[PDB]
Symmetry: D2
Subunit: 400 residues, 4 copies
């Protein structure tokens, strides 16, 4: 229970200042350093490589706890583990023996530069062009680069160009964020998730060395189409998002209840004597706390299954598909819950919760409303429906 | 027709500047003056007395149109008519003969100072102490004094104190906002409705003269108990709120639709080619536009009944109770609609509608989430249920 | 008010026996004859042809009132007017001169035989093959032939075959239900709407004469595609369906309230003394009564617009398309309302309301759940969404 | 796994005949005997006493499995284990050492006679009169006596009367169903759950011997008041109900999907070619399947906690209350889920799924609509709200 105590104490500290910090936007440098000092970035690194030797259930629990205090920090922390999962699923034994001890000593907080802002999500234009001795040159602009600012390493994705061994192949690389040619642009100014630094990043002539490549170019595509072990990255990452949503939900419900206990007035017109005994106040907390309990218990069970399959040598398409269905289902339920709860709980608090902007309760809705659009829930719902009705497991990709 | 065209033209100009103005909060003086110049503040004053001689259906449609452009200016405009209605329902013929031509010539924009911030609503501590001549001295601070800033007259409520004829009787008056001892405080910094100037007003020995009094002390309480004609004030005012919600909903839907046509990207992962042809985008617009059509059509019929009873010399408890039930029903449907739609419409626009704070679409949710808390919709629901199941009309009050 | 009084009295009498009658299914001959004796089948025929010269709002009110007592009789009554509307929109002047006085004298109650059970709803295989002197011979089986038992005339649709003037044109005709070769099969055995007689009808060498044809073959296709006046048939008919749903909803709500008032027990475990004072019982009635009030008020407005356009010589596509959007909106709201209400109201009554099957309250859900599937509400939603987002009116058909 | 395989095979046979059997109502003797032969009634009896030595998670999964095929048989099965649970928590080791081997050898299927039909659910009037040798005489009529027909023993509750040591104290006993003076009345005729035999049972001078009593008079009240281990009976039983709802939901979803794949027609008006590819069809299955996956996964965690506490020598009120809150939440979520999906899934199948009564899909709604009224979900919601807001665990009782 040590690591979860550490996460709980971090969250408590973040709650003190989240109201003022998220107003300002920009990079939460002090808080990212506190996460560095905690050791929790090393949760999944073996004790023999200097890490904590912990499990995915602990990582997921920590993500939700931090997110309940500060959704931007929960996001950055969660994405770090999505990035680490990808690295761990593709890195060579030589890379792990070098990088993981270095990640411990240098306290790596990972960011990524992957998606783009072209005509649709499938329009990637950041190129990797071959160089002598096996290196590649990266050129182009990425969007939504969460945790790009103050990142020690960047997980970067590119498509091969002018390549003898085949163009259009996906290369992934882990590079220093201060490698020459990398310009983090700092243009993140969002409705919510305001301290995630998910702005854009520009690559001009950026050199990637062979010992920084995560597998061969195109290997990720072969791994996902085959259902090799790396195909677990998507269910892992979508369950990370799910725990952000559950964390936000719990934090909003607890913050509302504290207000209701200390500040709500009884609607004495109706003969109510204390707000905490109002039948409709109680119904609102009951409806949402009940959904939250079930979603949280369900999410713990799926997290255990992530760990079980994480430890296998081989995961069958059926095992991967079943897990993805369970994860997609959890994310759908958590999405609906957090969006409804963060808006409707005002009705259990009263008008003065909104009349004083500085109370800042709208932060929960703004954070959830921003992140839940990451990928459209309507097509997660379609994927689960296509599984149930047509017995088709979703096609492994970066999003399913 | 002409009045509604003027309202439409006002709304158009407000839409240009609302995003910038509402961020700043404070008093929309230029826009209040444009409303003064439009003549619409006199909509319900008879032509005999210099007004437009128009009807409540026209007022309500004008409220919704302006609210759809700028919710604070729709609120200010609507509340002016709630203040006017109270004056019209309690003032003597002699008072109206003087006040109403004055309001036309001087372009009066009314505000109010009524509710307070103590243990529960209508736990009132602002006192009216009788003076030998029949004047009253007012002392205390009012809260939520919408339209208090830049008001030509304030509708004010107090409770008698040191009164041989009975303490605790509610008096009302219409007084100049710069009467000695009136301090309008400018302490309004809210989630939404940011330019309604609903801060506090402090009364330091404010004298109210006998010709400014509206009825006799406790007369409002007796009219409420009687369910007689002055008790129409509440259904009238609750239907004003309803039209703020319908206007916000219509404005949000049309603003989201503009973004969907111009900015949303197709989810090519699912093979869709234009976002405006996505089946799930279309379902969101259809579900909410459909509910809006029915709600608006229903509201027009209730507004018609408001006009009918407004014109009568006498109104029975049964007519008043039936109207209040119809108004409550409209408010319930409009409340649920606007709260769901201003949040869920993000799902038809995509992540970039939230990723870019300056788009500012969240203004609709913030405005509606703030105002819908005015009084709890749960007890409007109880009131309709008590009528339908038990044949009990609501107990008339400032809220029912 | 005379016509509505007659409908109200018919509905009262139907309420007495509906529970026993709908159990058995089959043909409600005594109740159909009661409608014949009432004269209401002639609501839309002019007084100068023997009819009542009434209006569509009267018809719609009578439909909802009768449906609230007996959904099957309300369906039969309403479909009579859909059949009549089709006849009136396509019939020649000499057809109207002979048919309408005859329909009064002989107290005609119309049925139809239109849809079929092939691969999809567009797949029509009942043929019209040319005979000498301009007659046609009809062959094949129709499905869902509402009101076909005890019908004085059937409205019948076929597609031309072996026709030198063109194959696959849609012809419509009004014929005697006992013409040689017409076999009403009596196979309607439904979850709800159990006395609408909507089973199959088999046509074996059935002769149709030129003076029974409603326009030329293919004329309905042209009138709908061009938006000429007969394109009103679909919004007229879809609003008929809407009033079935509103009538069922009102009937179920009122029947539930009676049980709650006289049989529901207080949940004394929570200190409730009377079920009628339970806060959650009151909340259920309030929610649904409020939505019904708004839906009914909105439906009245749309019914008036039907009458207004019914009286026009020409109706533009904007006028027809805006009416169809308003009708579709009303139907969507009424559909959601009646399906939720007829199921959820058990929670306001208690277990014994379901545990005593004889109480029969499930009739409302059975009737509503059956009819609301007539055409899919999801595509009504898409049609409203396509209009609001893309400014595309529904393309006229038998369904839109 | 062996045990779950046996339950799956039973369910598969029950599925073949449930549609025909449940119309008839009455007692499903052949199916009860198949359950007797399966051994599964002994799931919780230790191997030492001739039982299967299985756990509550296995029991709950078997209940859901059987319920998905035949809700009445799942109900009868599940209530057997609620009856067994009461016996296990209150009987002496000496009693269980005789009864449990006898239950194995004689293939006991337990029923109960507990609730009554007086002014409210707390109003109990079936009396137990103490006789001088320590026996009691039971007199009066019980209602809702699930499984009272063909029962090998009945768990019976009464209140002491003519008792010098205190009237009104609750006594429980396990007695033969054919003891002199027991009359099972066969008056069950319900909307759903039609073969649970939950009719009335009348007791005329029925003798209960000392060694048939479960604890001492009032002992159950003392256990509830102290939140001690016997008060686990409620969360155990409420989670049995929860698995009936999850079972019905899964059965209904799977039956609907078979129709959608086999019989639904594409809505060609809108350009659909396959119903199984319709976007709104897929969205219904996706929404409901996703909620079911999360609810089932959360339910498994709670079932493990039931087993954990079942094995404890002592249980604190905090452990009992935490478990009850988790069970209540699962029940709330499952109730809402099954009620919505058993009605809305028609929209995925089409009109002919309701127009052909013999398809019988309404059985799912009828079963779930009937059972979910067992106790009011509104007060389960209040109980979870009171815990979350005010940190008050539910007051232990037969319902909470
Ligand atoms: C945006 C807004 C404007 C309001 N304007 C007025 C007003 O002009 N006059 C008034 O008496 N109360 C006004 N109220 C207050 C309500 O009557 C009520 O006192 C308040 O919403 C209750 O606060 P509570 O739910 O936090 O207890 C306003 C409330 C809001 C939210
Ligand atoms: C708060 C937030 C953070 C995001 N972080 C990342 C990220 O770290 N890496 C990435 O590839 N995409 C990230 N995305 C983007 C999604 O993968 C996707 O590209 C985008 O949300 C689609 O935008 P649209 O719906 O407006 O078309 C993020 C999106 C949001 C809203
Ligand atoms: C299908 C069904 C089965 C029931 N079985 C039992 C039972 O076996 N034992 C029992 O004590 N109560 C049983 N109950 C009853 C509840 O304990 C409770 O008394 C009842 O649902 C209250 O009915 P009301 O809401 O109409 O007041 C059953 C109820 C239903 C609906
Ligand atoms: C209760 C009921 C009555 C119906 N009556 C008629 C009718 O009178 N004339 C007609 O053409 N179709 C009638 N329909 C059928 C619809 O036009 C449509 O063909 C059918 O609901 C589609 O079936 P599906 O959803 O199973 O594919 C009726 C349908 C129902 C459910
Ligand atoms: O889910 S994101 C994403 C979407 C599409 C392609 C790559 C990535 C990526 C990498 C790291 C974290 C998060 C994400
Ligand atoms: O609804 S508000 C209110 C609540 C309670 C007492 C008085 C008043 C008042 C007067 C004018 C406008 C608005 C309001
Ligand atoms: O709406 S039904 C229908 C569907 C499709 C083709 C024709 C018809 C028709 C004719 C009369 C009444 C009802 C209907
Ligand atoms: O939940 S039921 C119930 C309600 C109230 C008192 C006793 C009982 C009882 C006993 C056995 C099974 C089921 C039930």
């Amino acid at each position: 229970h040590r690591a979860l105590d550490v996460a709980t104490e971090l969250a408590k500290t973040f709650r003190v200042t989240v109201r003022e910090r998220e107003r300002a936007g920009g990079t939460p440098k002090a808080e990212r350093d506190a996460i560095r000092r905690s050791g929790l970035l090393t949760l999944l690194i073996s004790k023999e490589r200097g890490g904590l030797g912990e499990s995915w259930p602990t990582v997921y629990e920590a993500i939700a706890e931090i997110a309940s205090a500060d959704a931007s920090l929960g996001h950055l922390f969660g994405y770090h583990f999505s990035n680490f999962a990808y690295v761990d699923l593709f890195a060579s034994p030589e890379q792990k023996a070098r990088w993981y001890p270095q990640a411990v000593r240098e306290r790596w907080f990972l960011g990524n530069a992957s998606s783009e802002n072209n005509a649709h999500v499938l329009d990637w234009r950041v190129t990797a062009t071959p160089l002598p001795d096996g290196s590649y040159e990266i050129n182009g602009t990425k969007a939504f680069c969460s945790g790009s600012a103050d990142a020690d390493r960047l997980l970067v994705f590119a498509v091969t160009s002018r390549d003898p061994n085949g163009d259009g192949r996906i290369v992934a690389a882990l590079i220093p964020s201060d490698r020459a040619g990398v310009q983090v642009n700092g243009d993140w100014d969002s409705l919510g998730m305001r301290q995630t630094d998910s702005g854009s990043v520009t690559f001009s002539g950026v050199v990637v060395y062979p010992d920084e490549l995560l597998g061969t170019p195109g290997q990720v595509t072969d791994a996902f189409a085959s259902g090799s072990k790396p195909s677990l990255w998507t269910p892992i990452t979508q369950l990370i998002f799910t725990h952000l949503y559950l964390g936000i939900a719990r934090g909003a419900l607890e913050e509302a209840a504290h207000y209701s206990r200390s500040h709500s007035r009884p609607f004495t017109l109706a003969g109510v004597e204390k707000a905490t005994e109002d039948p409709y106040v109680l119904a609102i907390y009951g409806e949402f706390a009940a959904q939250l309990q079930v979603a949280e218990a369900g999410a713990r069970e799926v997290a255990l299954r992530v760990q079980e399959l994480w430890e296998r040598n081989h995961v069958t398409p059926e095992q991967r598909g079943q897990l993805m269905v369970q994860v997609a289902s959890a994310k759908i339920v958590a999405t609906r819950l957090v969006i409804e709860l963060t808006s409707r709980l005002y009705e259990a608090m009263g008008a003065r919760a909104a009349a004083s902007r500085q109370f800042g309760f709208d932060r929960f809705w703004r954070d959830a409303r921003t992140h839940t659009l990451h990928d459209p829930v309507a097509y997660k719902i379609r994927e689960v429906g296509n599984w149930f009705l047509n017995h088709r497991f979703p096609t492994p990709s970066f999003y399913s």
